[PDB]
Symmetry: C3
Subunit: 117 residues, 3 copies
């Protein structure tokens, strides 16, 4: 059993609901960073606070959740269901392998470093 | 696949040139974060906005681009050519495996999640 | 052999002592970011500046160091020794594979891109 990092870039105003939904499902641990970004070119022009970010990078938030591999699909599904709005700019999710996890306080590793105690 | 995350740490004043050159080559999707860092020991001491940084962490920008593996060399070439100044502190690039990519709005995955409209 | 990213999330007040202990041991290259986070549910409720945090995320610092795989254990040891306090919230470390490293100034790839010249 391996571990994975789910790295989701989502709208800043979706952070609270996504983190509630993840938490309600038992995926509590997460790290969040303020970022700016753009997605693919073309199609409907992205709007943020009232029509149009044609050239500049748009505020987003990055959520990183390290989970057991078997939980990745669950986590992605919860993020997409709760983050989406139907407009361009809703977000993108990347899954990255994590070879080791260590809890700083105790030097526990692996599965136990991810478990409620 | 496969997909890769190109994570480049560059000078803050090189964001605009690098973003434009990447865009002009088709690499539009990107996530940008403000960071501070140090590189290897040695090199002329870095100044930044008038202040010398003999020991302290220096402002940088992190750019993250998830791309098809076959595009990584092109992305690297573009970043190096446009980010460089010839002085120590120009940056460093890390290539990290990505096992899955999902577009939030549509649940599209893989190559389709990187494709332009 | 291979290269790894050590991604450590620690308390903001521990940045100074942890970075100095790393650089004293030769692990000078690092990228630092401001983040917020939470760990696992249960047990003692995390406190920060005089209040409990449960729904709300707590300020942390992320330190990213790309090192040789054979340096990871020592890096993790230094971080844990210096970052720990024994209270909930001390931190978590993730080890992520890095397939390629490139120095922007020179285009050097691999082992040399982590070394003083
Ligand atoms: N290939 C990528 N690499 C890195 N970050 C990306 C990439 N694609 C998107 N992002 C990040 O995700 C954010 C949201 O992207 P966005 O929702 O516009 O994706 P999209 O692929 O254009 O899909 P949509 O058509 O739904 O907009 C961007 O602002 C950026 O921060
Ligand atoms: N091994 C590393 N791990 C994490 N981040 C690093 C590492 N090396 C460099 N960085 C980041 O890249 C930034 C730029 O590094 P820098 O350009 O000084 O690299 P260098 O290896 O010292 O090459 P140069 O000789 O051109 O200075 C740093 O300030 C830091 O943010
Ligand atoms: N599974 C995870 N995924 C992503 N980030 C995490 C995860 N768990 C913890 N973090 C990050 O590490 C920080 C510190 O977590 P914390 O020290 O509370 O871990 P813990 O597992 O609850 O251990 P402790 O019992 O020692 O508190 C969090 O605020 C968050 O930034
Ligand atoms: Cl000291
Ligand atoms: Cl290890
Ligand atoms: Cl990563
Ligand atoms: Cl280095
Ligand atoms: Mg888009
Ligand atoms: Mg340097
Ligand atoms: Mg905790």
């Amino acid at each position: 059993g391996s571990m994975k990092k789910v790295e989701a870039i989502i709208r800043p105003e979706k952070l609270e609901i996504v983190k509630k939904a993840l938490s309600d499902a038992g995926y509590v641990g997460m790290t969040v960073s303020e970022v700016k970004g753009r997605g693919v070119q073309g199609g409907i022009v992205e709007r943020y606070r009232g029509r149009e970010y044609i050239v500049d990078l748009i505020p987003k938030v990055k959520i990183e959740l390290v989970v057991k591999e078997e939980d990745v699909d669950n986590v992605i599904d919860i993020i997409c269901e709760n983050a989406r709005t139907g407009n361009p700019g809703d977000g993108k999710i990347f899954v990255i392998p994590v070879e080791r996890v260590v809890r700083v306080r105790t030097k526990e590793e692996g599965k136990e470093a991810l478990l409620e105690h």
